[PDB]
Every structure is written in C-alpha cells, then in structure tokens.
C-alpha cells in the first residue's frame, strides 16, 4: 500500500466581527481522523474516525495544545500578510496550509510537503528536498528569508521524515480494518435519450475506496473521453466514493462503445460493453 | 500527530 497523512488548516479573517475562523483537519489516505473548528463546542482536537479514540489524555491534550498554537501562528499571519500587500482591514482574507508525508508499500518515507496559500493561491511552499523554499511574490519573498534565517525547513524535514511517517504507520496499524481496505467499485451502465438522434450513456462506479479512480470511454481504440462528461469523484457519506462519465453517442454506434474502469480493487481493468 | 513548531510568516 501507498499511504499518507495530511493535515489541512484553513484560516479566514473577519473584519469587524472578531477573531478569524480556524478549521483544522487530519487524514490518512481518504479518511479524516481528527478535526478542530474554532466554532464548535469543545474548543479541543476531536476524533473523527473510530480508531483514533483509543489514544488517551496525553494525546488529546497535546494534539489540542498544538492545534491552538497553529491557530495562533495563523491568526497573526493574516495580520502580517495584510501588511506585506498593504490591504484594507475592510476585506476578509483566507490562509490555508497543508503538510504531510507518503509511505511506500514498505511504510517508509517517500515524499513530504508543506504548502502555504493566502487568498487562494500559493504563497510559499517547501521544495521536495525539504531544505529549500519557493516563493510567489516580492511579498511572499520576505517570509522566505525569515524562514531561511530561522531554519524552518530543518524542523519540518525532521518531523516530515520522522514523526510523520512514524505516527502514520501507527495509525495505519491501529486502523488495520478501516484503512487496509480496498473496496472495489460496484459497476453500472445507464442509457437514456431525449428522443432519437442520440443516446446519453453513463458509466457508473459506486461504493469504491480509496477515491483514486480513472474512468475512460473508448470505442475499441477511439479516444472518446476527449468528448466525455466526467463529474468530480464525490463522497457517498459512508466512507466510499462515487463517480460517472457519459457520452452523447449516435444511436447505432453505441454498441461499439465500451467503458474502462481503473481502480486498485480490480485485478484487471474492467471493460463494460453495451 | 500534529507538527510541534509552527512559525509565523
């Protein structure tokens, strides 16, 4: 298996209404396991997957304290950034961060990243080498220097190449049943039409996990997917995902068209005929 | 498990 842990932090400023909103979420593959919402009740880091509840006081206390530190660094960044770009206190602004690490089928380090965005676009990001930084504007450049002189990349690398993979594995094990899972997509094929001159055929992939999947419409070699409508893979609500693709095919040629399903829960790529 | 050393920008 190729697994990962990702943390997503979004911070939105609220000119005139108080402290910015702060949401923090944690995953392992496509399963969220913790959350923190400055709006919620507890004001603590909360479990969001069953396999993480078993960790004790020590864990939540710490996890909670850290997330509060994260919000702090963010509460301020909004202020700091608003400055770099001399923006008015009148508008709302967003900051998002995300960092994590991937492990190979051996559960050893592979990749690690820490991306930072402000108002929707990259501000700064750590390079694959976890030693260098990348900046977008003259503004985001100031930040870079302030992190090259303070040795940020350093710390991240240690965490990213260590604690991250270390804990990921821990999670992967404690959640053997829930995460080592490979739910195969249950297939379907629907044909509808407005009235002659064409068919509306949709290939259907349902109840699959993880979300990694690729649907292709091909007529024995014809690259039809170039003119196929595919919807974003969407969540079912019970841990699995759904997705579909369709093409407007001239009544008649529809039987020559075949759909291709690609998912890690399938030995051989499925080919459905009409 | 969260990172323990956030840094301002």
């Amino acid at each position, epitope marked *: 298996g190729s697994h990962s842990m990702r943390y997503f932090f979004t911070s939105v400023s609220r000119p005139g209404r108080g402290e910015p909103r702060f949401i923090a979420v944690g995953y392992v593959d496509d399963t969220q396991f913790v959350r923190f919402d400055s709006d919620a009740a507890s004001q603590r880091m909360e479990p969001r997957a069953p396999w993480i509840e078993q960790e004790g006081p*020590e864990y939540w206390d710490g996890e909670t304290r*850290k997330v509060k*530190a994260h919000s702090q660094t963010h509460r*301020v960044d909004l202020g700091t950034l608003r400055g770099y770009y001399n923006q008015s206190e009148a508008g709302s602004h967003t900051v998002q961060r995300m960092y994590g690490c991937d492990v190979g089928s051996d559960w050893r380090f592979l990749r690690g990243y820490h991306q930072y965005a402000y108002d929707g676009k990259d501000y700064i990001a750590l390079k694959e080498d976890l030693r260098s930084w990348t900046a977008a504007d003259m503004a985001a450049q100031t930040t870079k220097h302030k992190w090259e002189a303070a040795h940020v990349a350093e*710390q991240l690398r240690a965490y990213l190449e260590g604690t991250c993979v270390e804990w990921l594995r821990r999670y992967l094990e404690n959640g053997k049943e829930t995460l080592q899972r490979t739910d195969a997509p249950k297939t379907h094929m629907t044909h509808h039409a407005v009235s002659d001159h064409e068919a509306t055929l949709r290939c259907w992939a349902l109840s699959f996990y993880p979300a990694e999947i690729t649907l292709t419409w091909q007529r024995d070699g014809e690259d039809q997917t170039q003119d196929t409508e595919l919807v974003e893979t969407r969540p079912a609500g019970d841990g699995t995902f759904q997705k579909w693709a369709a093409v407007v095919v001239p009544s008649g040629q529809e039987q020559r068209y075949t759909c291709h399903v690609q998912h890690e829960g399938l030995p051989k790529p499925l080919t459905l005929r009409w | 498990l969260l990172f323990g*050393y*956030p840094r301002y920008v």
Partner: T-cell receptor
Amino acid sequence: KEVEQNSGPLSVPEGAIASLNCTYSDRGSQSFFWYRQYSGKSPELIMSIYSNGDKEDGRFTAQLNKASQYVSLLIRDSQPSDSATYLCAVTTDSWGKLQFGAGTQVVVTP
Amino acid sequence: GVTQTPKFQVLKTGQSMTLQCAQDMNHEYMSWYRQDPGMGLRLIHYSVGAGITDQGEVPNGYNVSRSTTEDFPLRLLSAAPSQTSVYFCASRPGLAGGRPEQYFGPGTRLTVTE
C-alpha cells in the same frame, strides 16, 4: 515520572568513555536535549536531537530511539573539566512544557 | 542571552523581593524554575507571550508579570524559609523564529532566615 535518568554518581577515569541514558513516557515528544550543569552554575545546553538516529558534536555523541523512547550521550575522551551533572530534557511542541530528568552526576577521575 | 539579578540574596520571613530577568533574543516563552537537591528543576510560573502569565508546578507564594516581551519578573510578596532555593530563568522561542531551544539564565541563590 515523565523522564527517568541513568543513576547516581558515574565515575570514569580521564580519557575513558562516559555514557548517559535517558528514557521518556510521552509517545508524542519530538525534541530532545542535553544540558550540562557545573556545580553552583546554571544549566548549559550542549545537545539537541530532533530525529531518530545518531548525532555528533566534538566529544559528544547523542542517540535517539523513539521506538524505545530512549536518549543517549556518550562523552569520548573525558577530562575532569567534564565533571558536572547532566540533565536530560524532552518536549512535544512549542507550547509544551520542558521536562528534565533528575540528571546524572559525573565525577571524572584524573 | 538571558540575564537575571541579583546573584545572591538574604531576607527574613516577611520581606518582599523581586527577581529580575530579561532576554534579548526576541523570545515569546519565558519560565521561572527553582532547583532543590532532591527535586532537580521545578516550574513555578511561565509565559508564552506578553501580557500573559500562567502558573506551573509550584506557583505557591510567587507572583509574576509580563508587560513587555523582554522582561519577566518573579515576585515574592512575603518571604518564607521554604522559598530558600536557587532560581533559574529561562526563555524559549515559542512561535517566533529560531531552533526550538530553552536557554537558562545565570541563576540567583536566595536564603530566607527567621
């Protein structure tokens, strides 16, 4: 007790090897340190380890084994000047508390 | 680094005294510890930022302020022989820049007699 340290006085002759052990409880710790305190003076930081593995500076050599939650410090080529008591510290985050072990004294014999 | 005065001090039960401590490293987190023979170091009070101060392991009998990010004075309002110990001050980067490392001040030896 969050951090347990070696033992009582550790006597070693000049030029020998002075090895110190450290063990912690909190699974989440991510930073480890080694301070040196000379009698009647303040603790002085001498070693920091943030990753699993071995690190070296001068005559010191620090090891970290997160799996066993154990920390080390080996003083190569000892000198009486190395005589002092060594404190082990460990922490989880920026806002977590620094936890030192009782420290282990080291009487370097000439 | 971290500086603190006085170096030595004698007082009699009842006298008030303030242990001064400062740091010029632009650190956000400063702490006060007391060192006893059978106890190693013990936290008294600490502060993660200016205008902020929360208690530690043995806060009893000590007061503490933090109006500025550079200073962190420990105040005793009415001495006591149990307060006889060595006091160390320590700053830490916290959320600012620098390698996460706590540095100790020089210390201050105090002795309170009846």
